[PDB]
Amino acid sequence: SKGEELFTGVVPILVELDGDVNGHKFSVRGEGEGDATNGKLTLKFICTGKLPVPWPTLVTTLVQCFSRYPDHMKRHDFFKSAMPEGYVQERTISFKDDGTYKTRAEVKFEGDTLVNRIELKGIDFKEDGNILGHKLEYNSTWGSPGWVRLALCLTGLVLSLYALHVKAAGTAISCSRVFSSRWGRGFGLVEHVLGQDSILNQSNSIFGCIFYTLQLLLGCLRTRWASVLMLLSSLVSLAGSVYLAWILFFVLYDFCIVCITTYAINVSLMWLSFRKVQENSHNVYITADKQKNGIKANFKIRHNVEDGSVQLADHYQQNTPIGDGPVLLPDNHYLSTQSVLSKDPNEKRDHMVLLEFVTAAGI
């Protein structure tokens, strides 16, 4: 890029957004600096009254020319090559079971400043949704686990506590024929490796209470060690549930109902933990659009809802160069983005403080 020379060095950023969400008209003015050398953005946004939508739903709309491209991908940087004349970035943002943003932006160099002017229009939002009802977390640590996870873990806890009330003592005499066997204690395999004298050789329901309590507790967490811990624990729980299920049929030839219920519960927590691990994804997927001399892009942003659920936001993006000069057309690649939102204690206007780290990868 001959525009790449403009991004060696820290570059001042100014952002201006005129929006209209379901009639509610608003404006946002932001300022900061960008450092393409480390793919680092630092910006402060101010709602020039109070913002009618959550700030996270505006991060994506609110400068990919600061993405750090490694040297071996330098020829795949469309965004800098469009500079200084700029590019037009048009997006459709579809919130699942809710409205839709339509955005169009001019990103160009005005004097010494990189400017991103944005026109936004949001339609078909329900006034008690997650967006207009302001039901989205900002950067919280302790939150809800979701009524799905709550139902699963509470149900499993009641069932395991029931099994304890059974062995330690509608119609389940079929169960207590199962629990009394050698497999109702330490999954039948703790006595083989650690002996029967071990403290770890407990009734499987103890592992049940510890497991469902741990799942429900880690479901209230937004960090990764709880996510990976959830994945490994639910994986072990799944293996033990399939082993015990294999003992129930074809070996004992008995058919207890609480066992099938807890098998389904462990399958549910397994799918939930798998999803929760694998959809932590800010990956901007970029392909070249030759007909318009620009690029096309797909991705999915998942916002945390205050009740522990996730609000899905699908992103369809188009970028078209502003000049008639030459620009780079890339091969298929993706951008990795990490965003950290925070507040400024010196600011009383409705605002947002954004730190961002974007690097190119893929090709």
Ligand SMILES: CC(=O)C[C@@H](c1ccccc1)c1c(O)c2ccccc2oc1=O
């Ligand atoms: C409903 C339970 O918690 C008891 C169940 C179980 C299932 C998965 C993980 C822990 C505990 C369980 C049985 O399936 C079972 C099957 C065969 C033999 C004994 C059993 O006792 C159990 O602990």
